[PDB]
Write a protein that holds these residues in place. Structure first.
Motif, PDB file in Angstrom:
ATOM      1  N   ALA A  43      55.298  52.645  67.184  1.00 53.24           N
ATOM      2  CA  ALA A  43      54.825  51.801  66.095  1.00 53.24           C
ATOM      3  C   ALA A  43      53.754  50.813  66.526  1.00 53.24           C
ATOM      4  N   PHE A  44      53.390  50.793  67.809  1.00 50.84           N
ATOM      5  CA  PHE A  44      52.419  49.829  68.327  1.00 50.84           C
ATOM      6  C   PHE A  44      51.013  50.339  68.030  1.00 50.84           C
ATOM      7  N   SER A  45      50.623  50.207  66.764  1.00 50.90           N
ATOM      8  CA  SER A  45      49.308  50.618  66.289  1.00 50.90           C
ATOM      9  C   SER A  45      48.997  49.907  64.977  1.00 50.90           C
ATOM     10  N   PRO A  46      47.725  49.594  64.704  1.00 47.72           N
ATOM     11  CA  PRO A  46      47.395  48.907  63.443  1.00 47.72           C
ATOM     12  C   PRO A  46      47.695  49.726  62.200  1.00 47.72           C
ATOM     13  N   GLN A  47      47.734  51.059  62.317  1.00 46.68           N
ATOM     14  CA  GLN A  47      48.068  51.896  61.169  1.00 46.68           C
ATOM     15  C   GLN A  47      49.488  51.625  60.689  1.00 46.68           C
ATOM     16  N   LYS A  95      37.988  57.217  51.194  1.00 50.00           N
ATOM     17  CA  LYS A  95      36.879  58.131  51.461  1.00 50.00           C
ATOM     18  C   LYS A  95      36.043  57.652  52.643  1.00 50.00           C
ATOM     19  N   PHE A  96      35.951  56.335  52.831  1.00 49.56           N
ATOM     20  CA  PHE A  96      35.208  55.778  53.958  1.00 49.56           C
ATOM     21  C   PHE A  96      35.904  56.076  55.279  1.00 49.56           C
ATOM     22  N   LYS A  97      37.230  56.234  55.249  1.00 44.71           N
ATOM     23  CA  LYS A  97      37.955  56.611  56.459  1.00 44.71           C
ATOM     24  C   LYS A  97      37.476  57.959  56.993  1.00 44.71           C
ATOM     25  N   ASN A  98      37.272  58.931  56.104  1.00 41.97           N
ATOM     26  CA  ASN A  98      36.849  60.258  56.540  1.00 41.97           C
ATOM     27  C   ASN A  98      35.332  60.356  56.648  1.00 41.97           C
ATOM     28  N   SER A  99      34.617  59.312  56.233  1.00 39.32           N
ATOM     29  CA  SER A  99      33.162  59.327  56.252  1.00 39.32           C
ATOM     30  C   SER A  99      32.635  59.252  57.686  1.00 39.32           C
ATOM     31  N   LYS A 154      36.401  54.027  65.826  1.00 37.39           N
ATOM     32  CA  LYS A 154      37.570  53.158  65.941  1.00 37.39           C
ATOM     33  C   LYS A 154      37.618  52.140  64.808  1.00 37.39           C
ATOM     34  N   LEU A 155      36.521  51.405  64.602  1.00 40.43           N
ATOM     35  CA  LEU A 155      36.466  50.427  63.520  1.00 40.43           C
ATOM     36  C   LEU A 155      36.579  51.102  62.160  1.00 40.43           C
ATOM     37  N   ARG A 162      38.192  53.919  61.358  1.00 37.56           N
ATOM     38  CA  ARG A 162      39.572  54.310  61.093  1.00 37.56           C
ATOM     39  C   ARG A 162      40.469  53.092  60.912  1.00 37.56           C
ATOM     40  N   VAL A 163      40.187  52.002  61.630  1.00 36.94           N
ATOM     41  CA  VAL A 163      40.964  50.777  61.453  1.00 36.94           C
ATOM     42  C   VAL A 163      40.788  50.235  60.040  1.00 36.94           C
ATOM     43  N   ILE A 164      39.550  50.223  59.541  1.00 39.29           N
ATOM     44  CA  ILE A 164      39.304  49.748  58.181  1.00 39.29           C
ATOM     45  C   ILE A 164      39.908  50.704  57.161  1.00 39.29           C
ATOM     46  N   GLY A 165      39.818  52.011  57.421  1.00 39.63           N
ATOM     47  CA  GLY A 165      40.374  52.980  56.486  1.00 39.63           C
ATOM     48  C   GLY A 165      41.887  52.904  56.387  1.00 39.63           C
ATOM     49  N   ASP A 166      42.556  52.611  57.506  1.00 39.80           N
ATOM     50  CA  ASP A 166      44.005  52.440  57.476  1.00 39.80           C
ATOM     51  C   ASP A 166      44.402  51.248  56.616  1.00 39.80           C
ATOM     52  N   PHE A 167      43.631  50.166  56.684  1.00 38.69           N
ATOM     53  CA  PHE A 167      43.893  48.955  55.907  1.00 38.69           C
ATOM     54  C   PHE A 167      43.166  48.957  54.572  1.00 38.69           C
ATOM     55  N   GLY A 168      42.897  50.132  54.001  1.00 38.91           N
ATOM     56  CA  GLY A 168      42.172  50.181  52.740  1.00 38.91           C
ATOM     57  C   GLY A 168      42.932  49.533  51.600  1.00 38.91           C
ATOM     58  N   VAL A 169      44.220  49.855  51.476  1.00 37.64           N
ATOM     59  CA  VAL A 169      45.039  49.250  50.423  1.00 37.64           C
ATOM     60  C   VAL A 169      45.203  47.742  50.606  1.00 37.64           C
ATOM     61  N   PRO A 170      45.544  47.215  51.797  1.00 37.56           N
ATOM     62  CA  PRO A 170      45.592  45.748  51.931  1.00 37.56           C
ATOM     63  C   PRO A 170      44.263  45.066  51.659  1.00 37.56           C
TER      64      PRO A 170
END
Lengths: 517, 38, 182
Positions: free
Chosen positions: A30-34, A220-224, A230-231, A233-241
């Motif tokens: 669980a030690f991941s920003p996702q 969509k930006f996550k897969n873009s 790295k940045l 995917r980090v932003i894409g993981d936090f898309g809902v927040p």
């Protein structure tokens, strides 16, 4: 995982030996920003339905069971299921069918002059007896007869129900504050506005649309191909927040217009201090509980067991398909035992029975799913996410100043995002799309390149009829017969479908792992 | 508020009910063990 | 602006003299919905759904379909006010007290001095520069070889027509026009 051993508690022991060896990984993975982003997602995704359902029950049952009970029960059962469950990615929370039941009880207990909270102390007592026998006799092995047919029908129906409720809440908001030429500028606001207010419905629609748009755009930006990977995917993981925060700020900086906010109880107290305490006597609170209803509670216990069993087992089937890259194992016997036993125990303290909700668990699994170089690579299977979600749900009462500034329309857009994202893996939804496509654009899949187009369309249409039948049953007062009609699809697949489709066609269309026979 | 008086308290009655349930479960398990053997 | 209270007695003619509820939010909703429908229909043109002929026909009419849908949506909301298009009543000059359809080059009310008849070349030079750059750069953009233009374009004829028609319409007191880019 669904094989029968013949030993008493045979499935239960095998489930423990399968998953508990991975307990060390279930904390270190669980030690991941996702994981943190998924926690922030599922916290709202489980808190908002919890607040809504408890508040509804507080109305249909002189506040016998309310937000406080459905929040405390959700917290306790979620913590215990995350710490001890075999499939920790499941989110255990109240549901619609359980409200339809806990409503009939009050329409039965009020008619017969019985105690509603004391009748349950007895249903939960009968619930423990049933689950122990089922787990000991390996009753969860019947789940292996629930094929992709029933799983996808149930998932599509539940997602459609979720989206329809999300839209109906916005329709209700529009109806409560219609677009009028004039308004009364002096209207009492406590506890809710007593009259229509300007700009309320339109701002709610704008907030919901913006939340959904931002969530979809960040997904969509996550897969873009923009920004460093790295940045990105980090932003894409936090898309809902990020979408939730943006829309919360947007509504916060609009001071004049009123929008409905999240409302939580003042403190950790029962909903109706004039009715019941924290521990409810099984023999009755005000009047002596009759002896006949103690034995008559088996039939409501049977109905509750059927509902919880079907919901939890189909949800576990959906979230633990081999095509989802779940390489840690799932335990059908242990999860069912934990859920039903926790419900029976919480029935004593007046707290509601909970079940593994489909949409929330699928969203939790998808929020931890890692996509490689289009293709599913792995899933962040760990117990910390569900534990943190349950802890935050329990602490939701103490964080009222944070929750009191969050609109419901933001959560409506989040619900729409969850509904549209829960339909990705369903092959029924994929074959529904092929009904509006020419056959030359159909994908290279076993059910297209080995089956005729019209045969596949007829097979899809047979499933659509079942969806309509299940939808009609839900929109009737006898909506508690939905699990039985859902089960009746299994004889339809195993008996009537071979009478019109060949073995190869049914293997291609109904495949447990999407294989070409 | 005010609740009706009972001979058994809540822990006592819940222990009695759980003991009866465990006895029934054990009886059913023993019966099932008896079957599938003879 | 979004306000807690509004004055329900607001004069409407010729335009609303005070803030009105539900106006700006409905305008934002209409604009967002129109843009969303236009973009979705543009995607649907290249999509793999529907028969190709019907799909392409629908995609071609995507902008009119979005306009019609949003116009009907606003039409079915009677109470809320939204700003509409405003065209003049008839084919008449804006100010009948100032000028007619044909303007005398020697002056309408006061005698036009001779010196401005020669001094007008520099503003005419500026207008010619503006129109020339706009029209020629627009023609260069729209006639690039990558746009599959196989009929040819004229840089001399079009400029001559545009500037000559602007000069002719100037005699009638009508604005000069150029080939706009967008």
């Amino acid at each position: 995982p669904l094989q029968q051993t013949g030993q008493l508690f045979g499935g239960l022991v095998r489930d423990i030996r399968r998953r508990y060896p991975y307990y060390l990984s279930d904390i270190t993975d669980a030690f991941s920003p996702q994981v943190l982003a998924a926690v922030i997602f599922i916290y709202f995704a489980a808190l908002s339905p919890a607040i809504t359902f408890g508040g509804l029950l507080g109305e249909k049952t002189r506040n016998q069971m309310g937000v406080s009970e459905l929040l405390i029960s959700t917290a306790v059962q979620g913590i215990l299921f995350a710490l001890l469950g075999a499939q920790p990615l499941l989110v255990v929370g109240f549901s619609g069918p359980l409200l339809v039941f806990e409503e009939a009880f009050f329409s039965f207990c009020e008619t017969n002059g019985l105690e509603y909270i004391v009748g349950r102390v007895w249903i939960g007592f009968w619930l423990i007896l049933l689950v122990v026998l089922v787990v000991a006799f390996e009753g969860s092995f019947l789940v292996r007869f629930i094929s992709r047919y029933t799983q996808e029908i149930f998932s599509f129906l539940i997602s459609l129900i979720f989206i329809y409720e999300t839209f109906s809440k916005l329709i209700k908001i529009f109806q409560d504050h219609p677009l009028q030429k004039t308004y009364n500028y002096n209207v009492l606001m406590v506890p809710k506005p007593q009259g229509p207010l300007p700009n309320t419905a339109l701002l709610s629609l704008v907030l919901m649309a913006g939340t959904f748009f931002f969530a979809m755009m960040l997904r969509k930006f996550k897969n873009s191909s923009y920004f460093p990977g790295k940045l990105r995917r980090v932003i894409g993981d936090f898309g809902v927040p990020i979408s939730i925060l943006i829309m919360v700020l947007v509504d916060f900086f609009i001071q004049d217009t009123y929008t409905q906010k999240l409302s939580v109880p003042d403190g950790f107290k029962v909903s109706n201090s004039s009715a019941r305490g924290w521990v409810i006597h099984p023999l009755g609170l005000r009047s002596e509980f009759p002896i006949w209803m103690m034995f008559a509670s088996a039939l409501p216990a049977l109905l509750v067991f059927i509902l919880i069993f079907l919901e939890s087992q189909i949800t576990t089937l959906i979230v633990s398909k081999p095509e989802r890259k779940m390489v840690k194992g799932s335990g059908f016997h242990l999860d069912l035992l934990l859920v039903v036993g926790m419900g029976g125990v919480a029935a004593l303290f007046g707290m509601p029975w909970l079940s593994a909700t489909t949409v929330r668990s699928v969203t939790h699994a998808n929020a931890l799913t890692v996509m490689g170089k289009a293709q599913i690579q792995e899933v962040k299977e760990q117990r910390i996410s569900g534990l943190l979600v349950a802890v935050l749900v329990g602490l939701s009462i103490l964080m009222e100043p944070i929750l009191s500034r969050i609109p419901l329309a933001v959560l409506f857009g989040i619900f729409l995002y969850m509904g549209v994202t829960s339909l990705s893996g369903i092959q029924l939804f994929d074959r529904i799309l092929l009904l509006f496509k020419p056959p030359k654009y159909h994908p290279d899949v076993p059910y297209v390149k080995r089956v005729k187009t019209w045969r596949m369309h007829l097979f899809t249409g047979i499933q659509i009829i079942c969806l309509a039948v299940l939808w009609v049953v839900k929109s009737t007062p006898a909506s508690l017969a939905l699990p039985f009609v859902l089960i009746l699809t299994v004889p339809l697949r195993r008996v009537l479908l071979p009478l019109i489709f060949r073995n190869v066609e049914l293997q291609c269309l109904d495949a447990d792992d999407a294989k070409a026979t | 508020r005010v609740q009706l008086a009972h001979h058994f308290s809540e822990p006592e009655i819940t222990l009695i009910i759980f003991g009866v349930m465990a006895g029934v479960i054990g009886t059913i398990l023993l019966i099932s063990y008896g079957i599938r053997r003879l």
